[PDB]
Design a binder for this molecule. Sequence first.
Ligand SMILES: COC(=O)N[C@H](C(=O)N[C@H](Cc1ccc(-c2ccccn2)cc1)C[C@H](O)[C@H](Cc1ccccc1)NC(=O)[C@@H](n1ccn(Cc2cccc(C(C)(C)O)n2)c1=O)C(C)(C)C)C(C)(C)C
Lengths: 99, 99
Amino acid sequence: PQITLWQRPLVTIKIGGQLKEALLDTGADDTVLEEMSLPGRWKPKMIGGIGGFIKVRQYDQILIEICGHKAIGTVLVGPTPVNIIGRNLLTQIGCTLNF
Amino acid sequence: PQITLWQRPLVTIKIGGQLKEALLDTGADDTVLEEMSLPGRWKPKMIGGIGGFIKVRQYDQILIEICGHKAIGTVLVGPTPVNIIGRNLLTQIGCTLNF
Ligand SMILES: COC(=O)N[C@H](C(=O)N[C@H](Cc1ccc(-c2ccccn2)cc1)C[C@H](O)[C@H](Cc1ccccc1)NC(=O)[C@@H](n1ccn(Cc2cccc(C(C)(C)O)n2)c1=O)C(C)(C)C)C(C)(C)C
């Protein structure tokens, strides 16, 4: 698969055996997911962002499926307006900028 | 070039006869750059962000050479931690997300 950028790169994902939609965001260090609940334990933390900050719940070692490809990694859960897939998981699935 | 993502896709650009580093950000609709001066007229605008909106100046028909590639379009100036290069301009340099 190869994705142009004329629309928003909205890809579908599966976490917790649930179907979600997410943004393929290369300017995100971390993966930040909407309000949802997850197994395992977690540290609170502030994430940066354009103007101001938000509290993310940090879940390590989450199994996530981005678009057909399995990846394991840290996942941040908080008051975000969209599910954001950052570099940390984008690498895992061999995603790469190409012009 | 092919940019894998183990590190921030920070690249080099040229605007108003300046060289600046900027992030290649596929989860950004527009291009927003740090406080600088540019030709012509601007509208006020707000931008969403993760943790709230910031006031920006909107400029049109602005020329950016991104990574050796020439492009034109709407650029936003304001209080951002980094020059973000968005889709509005990435499409132009033929940029595509690959895996
Ligand atoms: C290191 O900091 C870091 O990794 N922070 C990240 C971050 O904020 N990344 C950069 C920014 C960044 C990067 C690096 C640093 C940095 C780097 C080094 C040192 C210090 N700072 C700081 C900020 C911006 C990011 O790509 C966001 C993601 C996003 C996308 C959509 C909605 C909310 C958030 N993009 C934007 O904020 C851009 N933006 C905002 C709204 N939109 C349109 C849109 C799309 C989809 C849905 C909607 C809704 C539902 C809201 O209607 N709107 C859009 O495109 C914008 C930038 C143009 C405003 C994450 C928090 C995402 C991880």
